[PDB]
Each structure stands twice: as C-alpha cells, then as structure tokens.
Design a protein around this ligand. Structure first.
Ligand SMILES: Cc1cc2nc3c(=O)[nH]c(=O)nc-3n(C[C@H](O)[C@H](O)[C@H](O)COP(=O)(O)O)c2cc1C
Ligand SMILES: Cc1c(C2(c3ccc(C(F)(F)F)nc3)CC2)c[nH]c1C(=O)N[C@H](C)c1nc[nH]n1
Ligand SMILES: O=C(O)c1cc(=O)[nH]c(=O)[nH]1
Ligand SMILES: [Mg+2]
Length: 378
C-alpha cells in the first residue's frame, strides 16, 4: 500500500502542501524523502510499444524529469523509481551558487502554473559530479536501474565572461558519467545567458562542447578504467535547450546552425517571460512553467521540426500533464517528453498516471507503437 505512488494519502498531503506550504519547502521535503529512500515507487514493467530512442539512447518509456528538479543529483534513484525513464540533473555551473534571493518560486494551482527566479542554485560541478558518481556505482550493482538514463544540464556561473570556459570545465569533470549533455543557453534568470542563442555564438558553443567531448575520448581511450561510466557506455550526446521567447528569424537561424553542427537533439523548451495573465504572478519576476506554456511550446516544436527538416530529434518540455498532452507533443515532432510542473501538481502518481493515459491513447488512435506517432501531425 504505502509503496504505491497512487496510495490515497499522497493526494491528500499534496493538496494541503499546495495550499498552505511554501513551494521551496515542499521541494526540500520531497528531496529529503528521496534522500532517505522513502518515496513510493512504481512496480510496473513498461510497455514495449511506448519505448523510444534518440540516436543510441534507448528510453524504456517516454517520460523523464526536466532539468532543475534535482539540481544537485541527490535524488536520482528515487525520482527514477517513481516510473520515469530518465532525468536531467542540473543545471550545474563550475562553482556553486546559492542563487537569487528568496522567495523566488511561486505556484498558481488554479492555472497549474509556476514562476521562478532561482538563478542556477547548485552545489557546483565538482560536488554534483561526486553525487552522480555515487549513483553510477549503485546503478552498476542494481539491475533495476541499468537501463535508466541520466543527462546533465550545464551552464555558466553568473559572473563568468566567456560561457565556453564554464561549459568545457563541466565537460572535463562530469562528462564521462553523463549519457547526454544539455547546453543551457535559455534560462531567463542569468543576465545575458539567452544572448548565446544568436547563431554565431551558438555555433561556436556547440562546436566547442563537441570538441571537448571528443578530446575527452581521445586522451583516455587506452586507460585501464573504461572512460564512459554511464548507461550507454558511449560518449554523451549533445543537446541544446532553447527558450520559447525568440522571433521567427532567430528560430530559423538557430535551426540552420543545428543542422550544420550536427547537434544530437533539441530540448523545446525552457520557461517563458511572455505570460502575464496570471493575476497572482503580477509583479513577480522569472520564467513561467506549466499549463500556460503548453501551447507556446507545442507550436515551437512544430516550427523547429520543420525548420530543421525533421533531421534533429526533439525532447519536449512545457505544460505536459496528461497522455493527450504527451501525444500532442509527439505528433508535433517530439521523440520523448520531460515533466516538471506535472510532478509539482500531480505528485507521486505523475509517471504511473501519464504512462497509463498515453498507452490507452495509443490503443484508441490505432498506432502500433509510439515511434509511429512521432511527427504525424505533419
Ligand atoms: C523551479 C524551476 C527550476 C528550473 N530550473 C531549470 C534548470 O536549472 N535548468 C533548465 O534547463 N530548466 C530549468 N527549469 C525549467 C524546466 O526544466 C522546464 O523546462 C519548464 O519548467 C517547463 O516544463 P513544465 O511546463 O513541465 O514545468 C526549471 C523550472 C522550474 C519551475
Ligand atoms: C509540490 C511539490 C512536490 C511534490 C510533494 C512535496 C511534498 C510532499 C509531502 F510529502 F510533503 F506531502 N508531497 C509531494 C508533488 C511531489 C515536489 N516539489 C514541489 C514544489 O512545489 N516545487 C517547487 C515548484 C520548487 N521549489 C524548488 N524547486 N521547485
Ligand atoms: O535556475 C533557474 O532560475 C532556471 C534555469 C532555467 O533554465 N530555467 C528556469 O526557468 N529557471
Ligand atoms: Mg565545483
């Protein structure tokens, strides 16, 4: 009973938390339950007809946890065991950062929306790398986790002048333990970060990251210890996470760069600064997540799927709460889905519930498997 993510008490506690308890306190308590391995867990074998892949990344189901949920990689095992196929830890920076001043996170239950001005609070690449190493050693001994995927989102310290120096630092420390690297050029809460989405700068960033990963492989290929201590046993793939607050010319220029640099995937999208209809967020700063971002980010998937001529796989992030939401992202062009706000508002049952809803929908719509639906809207 207690172990079951749908155990009736979780929804009762969650409704109480969302009404009376500060958002960051709720999150810290979630993390503490995860640290002491007392979160519920999903005991289901996932349907093989809902598996999916990006390149050699073989996802056991299409639902992962988005970056920012476990910034320091302290809760990996327990979050995955809720029923998710992967998690993106981070965003990490070379040096630790406490972030912007609190309160900096606010929820609106009515609209299932969040606004945050966190500012890349994390313990720093060195410490997070130790946390990921601990997970990778537990995984090596637990066959229950051997196929789960862990990506690492990397960014810059607030005061760093050249973003690439920070990106290279992170690759050389944590890259060997990552199944993929996500380049974060889209947070709205680090001044100047989003300027790096300009095509010229983005191109140099992508080529520099790819070159640093390639040098990691070259210089350690005949080491006694195998270099890739991750799930794939291969060098990490490289993804870029994009902001939805771009004009059509910027989107097109970005897509051209993604085609020329052979990026492995794009994460569409980060939070938006263009929603101001949420009364309770008036005179609050930061990016908005959740239901009000669904349509914006789904339209953005369709745009980039077409601008890249379907050659760049897509990871969907933005207002996914239901199996219908997930199928809309997939038919729009996405190969896999990331959740954040769904976890906040639906709680422990999030993965069990959305996986069941998507499966039934694949049945109803007549698909043989999930891959058949990718980009079918087009
Ligand atoms: C409190 C909070 C912190 C986040 N931190 C990060 C982060 O560090 N890196 C990142 O790439 N995205 C971060 N995000 C964005 C999420 O990963 C996700 O893209 C966004 O919330 C949209 O998905 P959703 O509508 O399902 O919440 C954060 C979001 C929230 C709400
Ligand atoms: C509500 C919630 C949760 C859940 C939770 C938390 C606590 C408990 C309980 F055991 F205490 F009852 N149950 C569920 C749904 C699983 C995790 N995080 C949050 C949350 O608000 N996070 C905000 C947006 C945040 N703050 C920093 N980064 N993000
Ligand atoms: O740490 C943050 O403030 C943050 C980063 C990010 O990429 N997205 C976001 O909404 N917040
Ligand atoms: Mg460090």
């Amino acid at each position: 009973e207690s172990y079951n993510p749908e155990f009736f008490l979780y929804d009762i506690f969650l409704k109480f938390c969302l009404k009376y308890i500060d958002g960051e306190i709720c999150h810290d308590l979630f993390l503490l339950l995860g640290k002491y391995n007392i979160l519920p867990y999903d005991t289901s074998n996932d349907s093989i007809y809902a598996c999916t892949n990006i390149k050699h990344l073989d996802f056991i189901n299409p639902f992962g946890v988005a970056a920012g949920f476990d910034k320091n990689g302290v809760c990996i095992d327990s979050i995955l065991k809720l029923g998710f196929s992967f998690i993106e830890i981070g965003t990490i920076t070379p040096r630790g950062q406490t972030g912007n001043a609190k309160p900096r996170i606010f929820r609106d239950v009515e609209s299932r929306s969040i606004i945050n001005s966190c500012g890349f609070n994390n313990m720093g690449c060195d410490k997070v790398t130790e946390n990921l190493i601990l997970f990778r050693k537990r995984q090596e001994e637990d066959k229950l986790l051997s196929k789960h995927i862990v990506g690492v989102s990397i960014g810059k310290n607030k005061d760093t002048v050249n973003i690439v120096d920070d990106l290279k630092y992170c690759i050389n420390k944590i890259g060997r333990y990552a199944d993929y690297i996500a380049i974060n050029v889209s947070s709205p809460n680090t001044p100047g970060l989003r300027d790096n989405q300009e095509a010229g700068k983005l191109k140099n960033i992508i080529l520099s990251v790819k070159e640093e990963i390639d040098n990691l492989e070259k210089n350690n290929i005949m080491n006694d210890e195998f270099l890739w201590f991750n799930t794939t046993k291969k060098k990490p793939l490289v993804f870029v996470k994009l902001a939805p607050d771009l004009n059509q010319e910027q989107k097109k220029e970005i897509a051209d760069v993604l085609l020329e640099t052979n990026i492995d995937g794009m994460i569409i999208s980060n939070t938006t600064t263009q929603i101001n209809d949420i009364k309770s967020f008036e005179n609050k700063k930061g990016g908005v997540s959740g239901a009000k971002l669904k349509d914006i980010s789904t339209k953005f998937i369709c745009e980039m799927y077409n601008y890249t001529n379907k050659q760049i796989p897509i990871i969907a992030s933005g207002g996914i709460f239901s199996g219908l939401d997930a199928l809309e992202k997939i038919e729009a062009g996405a190969s896999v889905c990331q959740l954040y706000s769904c976890l906040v508002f639906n709680g422990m049952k999030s993965a069990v519930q959305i996986k069941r809803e998507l499966n039934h929908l694949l049945y109803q719509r007549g698909y043989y498997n999930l891959k058949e639906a990718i980009g079918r809207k087009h």
